[PDB]
Write an enzyme that holds these catalytic residues in place. Structure first.
Site, PDB file in Angstrom:
ATOM      1  N   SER A   2       0.820  -1.206   0.000  1.00 38.77           N
ATOM      2  CA  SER A   2       0.000   0.000   0.000  1.00 38.77           C
ATOM      3  C   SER A   2       0.857   1.260   0.000  1.00 38.77           C
ATOM      4  O   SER A   2       0.566   2.214  -0.731  1.00 38.77           O
ATOM      5  CB  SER A   2      -0.943  -0.007   1.202  1.00 38.77           C
ATOM      6  OG  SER A   2      -1.728   1.173   1.240  1.00 38.77           O
ATOM      7  N   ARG A  51      -9.014  -0.115  -3.078  1.00 39.81           N
ATOM      8  CA  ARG A  51      -9.687   0.603  -2.004  1.00 39.81           C
ATOM      9  C   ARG A  51      -8.951   1.876  -1.610  1.00 39.81           C
ATOM     10  O   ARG A  51      -9.283   2.483  -0.585  1.00 39.81           O
ATOM     11  CB  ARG A  51      -9.860  -0.308  -0.786  1.00 39.81           C
ATOM     12  CG  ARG A  51      -8.555  -0.715  -0.119  1.00 39.81           C
ATOM     13  CD  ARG A  51      -8.804  -1.677   1.032  1.00 39.81           C
ATOM     14  NE  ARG A  51      -9.549  -1.053   2.122  1.00 39.81           N
ATOM     15  CZ  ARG A  51      -8.994  -0.341   3.098  1.00 39.81           C
ATOM     16  NH1 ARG A  51      -7.681  -0.161   3.125  1.00 39.81           N
ATOM     17  NH2 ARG A  51      -9.751   0.189   4.049  1.00 39.81           N
ATOM     18  N   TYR A  52      -7.963   2.294  -2.396  1.00 40.16           N
ATOM     19  CA  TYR A  52      -7.198   3.503  -2.127  1.00 40.16           C
ATOM     20  C   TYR A  52      -7.255   4.528  -3.248  1.00 40.16           C
ATOM     21  O   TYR A  52      -7.221   5.728  -2.968  1.00 40.16           O
ATOM     22  CB  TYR A  52      -5.725   3.159  -1.860  1.00 40.16           C
ATOM     23  CG  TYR A  52      -5.493   2.372  -0.592  1.00 40.16           C
ATOM     24  CD1 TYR A  52      -5.444   3.006   0.643  1.00 40.16           C
ATOM     25  CD2 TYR A  52      -5.318   0.995  -0.629  1.00 40.16           C
ATOM     26  CE1 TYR A  52      -5.229   2.290   1.805  1.00 40.16           C
ATOM     27  CE2 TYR A  52      -5.103   0.271   0.527  1.00 40.16           C
ATOM     28  CZ  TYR A  52      -5.059   0.924   1.741  1.00 40.16           C
ATOM     29  OH  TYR A  52      -4.845   0.207   2.896  1.00 40.16           O
ATOM     30  N   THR A  53      -7.342   4.092  -4.501  1.00 38.83           N
ATOM     31  CA  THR A  53      -7.301   5.008  -5.627  1.00 38.83           C
ATOM     32  C   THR A  53      -8.657   5.677  -5.839  1.00 38.83           C
ATOM     33  O   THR A  53      -9.706   5.167  -5.437  1.00 38.83           O
ATOM     34  CB  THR A  53      -6.881   4.275  -6.902  1.00 38.83           C
ATOM     35  OG1 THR A  53      -7.843   3.259  -7.210  1.00 38.83           O
ATOM     36  CG2 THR A  53      -5.515   3.630  -6.717  1.00 38.83           C
TER      37      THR A  53
END
Ligand code: JHN
Lengths: 380, 522, 97, 51, 92
Positions: free
Chosen positions: A25, C72-74
């Protein structure tokens, strides 16, 4: 050594830096935004097992950190004299930070005593009002920024001694009012909020008023009447006078009737003596000594007269919060690599943190006990 | 800039994480007994509009929506929660009606999230009934862009019906399920008598309930759990012996396994115990389970009573297991051990508050509707002067100003209660025949159509006005007296019990006291 | 087509990619999730197309071979040039399948 | 024969049956709906290389 | 507008009012009165719009769906401008 570790060009220790973040991440953007001179990053995978809960010299899963930093004993190899631990601002970030800290404490106390462990402080809020940008990392800083924006050169016009009330006095008054409202919201767990909000405008009270019954009766009658007037929901208000004393010791009692069950709230000498009630009375006197009925405040090209100070404050906050934008980063793998370089690991703009070895207490002993973990939660 | 900091940050972060996990992750509430994850999933399914009488929908869409808006904390947890809610053998009353491979007792996991199709059930609509009527408070999302209801205006105490099993940083809870009919009976009894004793509640509710039947033996444990909050109870499977009419042989039949017991692991453990000579009297092992009921066949060794072997199994096999009853939940955001009476009282208070707020909302809506209808009827009374005023005014704003400024005649054909026919914010300078208009009233008059000028609209308006009068009168009456509200609550509870009634599944055979007391004090 | 029906223009706020992926899997392309996400990442990489079409924000990889972050971040959205591709669609200009 | 293939109670060949389907998507429901007398199902993993 | 007013006020049923509007012709005042063609749809029958003028069920339904704000000294010029713009658009 292979796989995850990405060292720098320089090989002499005490000049390079080491970091510990989430691998897929964060480490990707971290490597894409780092330098290739004195930067090194060691990714991680999930969490790390505790030391005290399961202590075993043979139990090992990763072992990469201790093997790459030292030989595991440490005075011989002191590579990477400076290490920094970047961590997300969520609760799991604080948890994994606590585990890392207790790990480095119970494994190698010498590297912590010599001042080598560092903690980063990534930003938390990104406020952008058109061209005006701002980086905010804390909640108190965000609140101060909101108060500053809500008071962009306001000027109050009342019928008091000051024709144009403005300046730092108004800012200090708003700050004290916000602090008192926070204190009232904190004490609301004990007593209802209606009476605490009404005592702001109600007259003062003195322990010398326990002699005359007419004064207490008039005060409680005015209180109940104003509460019934301001009551817009399905509730009522009643008064009560009781004498539990030798001669008088007059103590007012307020009787409120909610949905199905009535509830009283007597007043004792301890409630009058308490510092919270004293602060409330001082603020009420200070606000009544203002005569803020007919007011005129403008921010910044329009003004509107109101009849309440909190209503004017809410209107100013609403006018200040019309066209602003707030971006909250809940992860290192969310922002751009250049933004991370400029705001977190910029040698001229970063703000690191140093840990100390001041005292050796038994906090780590009560860390995992099932008894200390049960007695420690005394946040009441 | 390297500021020196103290080590206390470790303890500070640990306390912060512990508080966060205890408040917002593990411990459910006492007013609905629902986790925040379940809450967000149900709210997303309600906003999406997937009713029970509609077609099925893919679960991936719902999972993505929940991750995007309300629960951005992974995908595995949400999917596992959905699968758990979809398993019939995991809850006494299922909530999400699905279709596909949802696993079974064999331990097989469910299929991927691109094959199953789920939708709400008939009972799920009773949990979030009357939500848009401003019955609860709204909570902002992670970034302050949406609203989340604090509690749900439920009608069934799901905490007592199904319960949950969660663990905090330092606390833990475990609540057995129960039967809905006995819970409704106990609630009605508590409404009848506020000072009901624990013995009466125990008489109304003998014991817990499970999705799979079993044999409950311990009564002192459940008594202490209902009285204090802690206790232990034993679970025994159902089995018996078989003897054929001919010589044949003995055979043990297993009709059911205890709660949360793996069947394949149990068979493997029994085979291992038979191989290790630890158990005697067992020759082989077969299976006859089908779609008509689980059936396990065990062949008894020749020249064996089988009862001693059965007792040895009951002592060793997982067919007899205890249970860690522990009632822990949040009362005002803090862990507090609560008994049955406190939960019932909290549920009653929550229901009273929800009903009162819904009644106030409906009363305000009816008041606004009647206030608009009065002005509409006054406009319908005299129409021709409005016609000239519109035809001669070039500007609609000037026409509205002329309508508001000029009074009216208030014809006899146009002309209720003494009060309660006007909003609270309305000034007494309007509606003193004599009558005055309002900017909103004039705007509503200007928004009329041509179809409202028939010989049928007047009677409809009069009937609607009479119905609104009756409704506001009934609402004022039910708000004035609390006995009517209590009767409404009783009628609603009786209706729910009649609609969602069922029959007992488990069975309680008390032997922990019959063997002890009558053999110790005689 | 899913991005056009959803209503994610260029002058609007960003949106999570997981929602779009789930919508595409649910309605039009029920053939996994990895292919759709890889296609989105490929469209988001500037060094992979002469003219990008999906304006995003986050770790989209680079020439070093590092893969992009999780879905789930971009945050992605349409660009100014993407609206020229599907311009005048509701005017009955093409056929429906 | 670890784990995947679950044979039947009968051991004499020419009486039992064998199946080949997708493992995680199909084999679960296949085993949950099959018989435990003369049924056997062997899961699969993706595709198989060509000969 | 006035004959429509009497027709609406005297007809108890709106369907009967629509039937009376469709069945009865109109006067086609001078203030009410384009191209020779291309001002009518293809599916429209030549028995309508022959001054003389006839209505249609859809036309009568649209007439019954009017409001009171369309009776000012500003709506007529807007309608005329919109009609001229539509003529120019269909010509182009
Ligand atoms: O991370 C790993 C590591 C090893 C590994 N080995 C086997 C295996 O099966 N898996 C392994 N994994 C993980 C998992 C594969 N993983 C791929 C991603 C997939 N994502 C599910 C998903 C998410 C979303 C969807 C659809 N599907 O649409 C809406 C938006 C979010 C879940 C399964």
């Amino acid at each position: 050594l292979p796989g995850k570790l990405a060292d720098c060009q320089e090989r002499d220790p005490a000049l390079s830096e080491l970091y510990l973040v989430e691998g897929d991440s964060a480490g990707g953007s971290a490597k894409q935004g780092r330098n290739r001179k004195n930067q090194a990053i060691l990714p991680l995978k999930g969490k790390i097992l505790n030391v005290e809960k399961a202590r075993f010299d043979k139990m090992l899963s990763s072992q990469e950190v201790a093997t790459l930093i030292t030989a595991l004993y440490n005075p011989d190899k002191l590579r990477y004299h400076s290490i920094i631990i970047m961590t997300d601002a969520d609760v799991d970030g604080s948890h994994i930070r606590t585990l890392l800290l207790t790990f480095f404490y119970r494994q190698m106390p010498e590297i912590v005593e010599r001042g080598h462990v560092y903690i980063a402080q990534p930003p938390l809020y990104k406020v952008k009002k058109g061209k005006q940008e701002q980086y905010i990392k804390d909640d108190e800083a965000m609140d101060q920024y909101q108060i500053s924006i809500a008071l962009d050169g306001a000027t109050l016009h009342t019928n008091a001694s000051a024709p144009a009330l403005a300046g730092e006095a108004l800012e200090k008054l708003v700050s004290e009012y916000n602090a008192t409202q926070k204190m009232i919201n904190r004490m609301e767990r004990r007593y209802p909020k209606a009476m605490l909000k009404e005592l702001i405008y109600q007259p003062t009270l003195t322990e010398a008023d326990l002699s005359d019954e007419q004064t207490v009766t008039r005060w409680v009658n005015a209180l109940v009447s104003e509460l019934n007037d301001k009551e817009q929901h399905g509730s009522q208000w009643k008064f009560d006078v009781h004498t539990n004393a030798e001669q008088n010791l007059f103590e007012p009692i307020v009787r409120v009737r909610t949905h199905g069950v009535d509830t009283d709230y007597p007043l004792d000498h301890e409630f009058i003596t308490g510092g919270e009630y004293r602060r409330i009375c001082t603020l009420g006197e200070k606000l009544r000594g203002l005569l803020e009925e007919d007011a005129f405040i403008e921010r910044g090209e329009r003004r509107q007269p109101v009849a309440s100070f909190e209503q004017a404050l809410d209107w100013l906050v609403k006018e200040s919060r019309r066209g602003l934008s707030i971006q909250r980063y809940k992860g290192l793998g969310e922002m751009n690599p250049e933004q991370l370089w400029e705001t977190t690991m910029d040698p001229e703009s970063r703000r690191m943190l140093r840990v100390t070895v001041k005292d050796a207490i038994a906090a780590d002993q009560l860390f995992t006990t099932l008894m200390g973990d049960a007695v420690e939660p005394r946040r009441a | 800039i390297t500021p020196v900091n103290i080590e206390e940050e470790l303890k500070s972060s640990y306390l912060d994480y512990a508080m966060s996990v205890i408040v917002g992750r593990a411990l459910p509430d006492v007013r609905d007994g629902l986790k925040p994850v379940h809450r967000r999933v149900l709210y997303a399914m309600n906003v999406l509009g997937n009713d029970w009488n509609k077609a099925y929908k893919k679960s991936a869409r719902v999972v993505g929506d929940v991750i995007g808006k309300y629960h951005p904390h992974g995908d595995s947890a949400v999917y596992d929660t959905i699968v758990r809610m979809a398993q019939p053998f995991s809850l006494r009353y299922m909530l999400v009606d699905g279709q596909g491979n949802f696993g079974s007792i064999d331990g097989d996991s469910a299929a991927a999230m691109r094959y199953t199709e789920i939708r709400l059930a008939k009972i799920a609509h009773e949990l979030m009934a009357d939500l848009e009527k401003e019955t609860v408070d709204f909570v902002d999302n992670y970034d302050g862009t949406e609203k989340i209801p604090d509690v749900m205006p439920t009608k069934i105490p799901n905490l007592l019906v199904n319960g949950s099993s969660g663990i905090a940083v330092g606390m833990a809870t475990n609540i057995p399920p129960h039967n809905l009919t006995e819970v409704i009976n106990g609630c009605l009894a508590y409404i009848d008598d506020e000072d009901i004793s624990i013995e009466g509640l125990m008489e109304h509710i003998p014991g817990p309930d499970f999705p799979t039947a079993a044999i409950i033996n311990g009564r002192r444990g459940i008594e202490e759990a209902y009285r204090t909050g802690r206790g232990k109870v034993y679970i025994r499977a159902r089995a018996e012996v078989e003897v054929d009419a001919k010589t044949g042989r003995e055979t043990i039949i297993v009709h059911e396994i205890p709660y949360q017991v793996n069947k394949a692991r149990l068979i493997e453990k029994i085979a291992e115990l038979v191989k290790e000579k630890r158990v005697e009297g067992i020759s082989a092992l077969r299976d006859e389970s089908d779609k008509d009921g689980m059936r396990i066949v065990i062949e008894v060794k020749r020249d064996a009573v089988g009862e001693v072997v059965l007792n040895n199994l009951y002592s060793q096999t997982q067919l007899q297991v205890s249970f860690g009853i522990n009632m822990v939940a949040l009362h005002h955001g803090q862990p507090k051990i609560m008994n049955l009476k406190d939960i019932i009282a909290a549920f009653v208070r929550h229901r009273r508050e929800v009903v009162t707020r819904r009644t106030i909302f409906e009363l305000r809506k009816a008041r606004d509707r009647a206030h608009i209808l009065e002005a509409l009827a006054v406009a319908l009374a005299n129409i021709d002067p409005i016609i000239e005023l519109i035809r001669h005014a070039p500007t609609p704003a000037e026409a509205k100003t002329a309508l508001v400024a000029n009074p009216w005649q208030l014809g006899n054909v146009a002309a209720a209660g003494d009060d309660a026919a006007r909003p609270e914010w309305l000034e007494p300078e309007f509606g003193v025949g004599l009558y005055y208009l309002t900017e909103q009233q004039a705007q509503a008059i200007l928004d009329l159509r041509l179809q409202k000028l028939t010989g049928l609209e007047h009677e409809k308006l009069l009937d609607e006005y009479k119905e609104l009068l009756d409704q506001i009168a009934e609402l004022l009456r039910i708000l004035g007296s609390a006995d009517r509200l209590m009767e409404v609550i009783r009628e609603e509870l009786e209706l729910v019990r009649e609609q969602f009634g069922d029959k007992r599944r488990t069975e309680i055979t008390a032997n922990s006291a019959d063997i002890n007391l009558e053999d110790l004090i005689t």
